[PDB]
Write a protein that binds this ligand. Sequence first.
Ligand code: NA
Length: 129
Amino acid sequence: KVFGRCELAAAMKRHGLDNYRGYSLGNWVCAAKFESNFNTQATNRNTDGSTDYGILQINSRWWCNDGRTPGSRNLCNIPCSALLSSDITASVNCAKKIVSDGNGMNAWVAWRNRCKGTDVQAWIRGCRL
Ligand code: NA
């Protein structure tokens, strides 16, 4: 599923991401834009042989199982395929664990490089929330 910007903002807010570990909703929408372009089916191979899955490009190295990432963990206890669903519940539940891991949203290199310190509120502009 390719979410609308405001459509994704609403779904993330409903699932409790607005101000989760102090990160305003615009941060999460900005991260999703640059990670996936809001496409739940987005997959991208990393140089380390791990793969990133879904709207928030969650890594098979630590967070989900894809069965082809040697020496990897599955800390979200999910098949990586479950992070591609049109329902973002598994991605959001897993993102809450990632962002709580110690480095906050710096875990998303695209957030650090493209969203951090910017006017992230612009990403929820004109949305009925
Ligand atoms: Na894994």
